[PDB]
Design a protein around this ligand. Structure first.
Ligand SMILES: [Zn+2]
Length: 257
């Protein structure tokens, strides 16, 4: 099965998922000098005050916090989106070292980690139908750099002990994802894909310009998670990021000058 090691990592994925060599794959390098400012783009509208988190899960390739998405509780609108997208989960990608770990890069700069907040377009009724549509998902990407601790992340770091191995889950209620946002919502946006199999090209990417800072101690705890299940030989969950893919016929647009 696919993963991030030498015999099953990203360079191998195309044998089981040939869309890996597709026309609108993610992530990409954001060249800040060639991105086009578009005054037509609207500000993002993030409405997370009624979010209901349920659970945190180690899925064997990352950890993810899941939200109740049976109603319009936590939604993203605006920016380049048409319609309403509900939050279903967020997860992270990170490195074995502070100088790598993000999926997107900015002028080839890598960050220590990247947060993905995944939302699906309510017009398609459920997540499984949305991923089959070119405008089915909207993913907010936030970079993490190492510096000062992020208070709103600590609740997450504290429970990782309890979901160390693949398939472990824990109740995780009353977590407010607003504490993970930077001050500014300026963004870049381009059409792309999921960055893990099945790599479907159903995502409008919205990547925030401003990183959030986390402390070395906080990302250290990420690196203690395991890819393996309980009882299996220990393999640390690190470097679970896909490298930048060719931009091909796409335009990155910026909401700012
Ligand atoms: Zn992701």
């Amino acid at each position: 099965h696919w993963g991030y090691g030498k015999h099953n990592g990203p360079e191998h994925w195309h044998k089981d998922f040939p869309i890996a060599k597709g026309e609108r794959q993610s992530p990409v390098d954001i060249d800040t000098h060639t991105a086009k400012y578009d005054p037509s783009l609207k500000p993002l509208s993030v409405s997370y005050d009624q979010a209901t988190s349920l659970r945190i899960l180690n899925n064997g390739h990352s950890f993810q916090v899941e939200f109740d998405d049976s109603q319009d509780k936590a939604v993203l609108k605006g920016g380049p989106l048409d319609g309403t997208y509900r939050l279903i989960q967020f997860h992270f990608h990170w490195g074995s070292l502070d100088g790598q770990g993000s999926e997107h890069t900015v002028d080839k700069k890598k960050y220590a980690a990247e947060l993905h907040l995944v939302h699906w377009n309510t017009k398609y009724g459920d997540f499984g139908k949305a991923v089959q549509q070119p405008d089915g998902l909207a993913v907010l990407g936030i970079f993490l750099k190492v510096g000062s601790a992020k208070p709103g992340l600590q609740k997450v770091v504290d429970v990782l002990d309890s979901i160390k191995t693949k398939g472990k889950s824990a109740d995780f209620t009353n977590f407010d994802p607003r504490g993970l946002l930077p001050e500014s919502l300026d963004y870049w946006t381009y059409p792309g894909s999921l960055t893990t199999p099945p790599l479907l090209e159903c995502v409008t990417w919205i990547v925030l310009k401003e990183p959030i800072s986390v402390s070395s101690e906080q990302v250290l705890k990420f690196r203690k998670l395991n890819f393996n299940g309980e009882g299996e030989p220990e393999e640390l969950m690190v470097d679970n990021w896909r490298p930048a893919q060719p931009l091909k016929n796409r335009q990155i647009k910026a909401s700012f000058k």
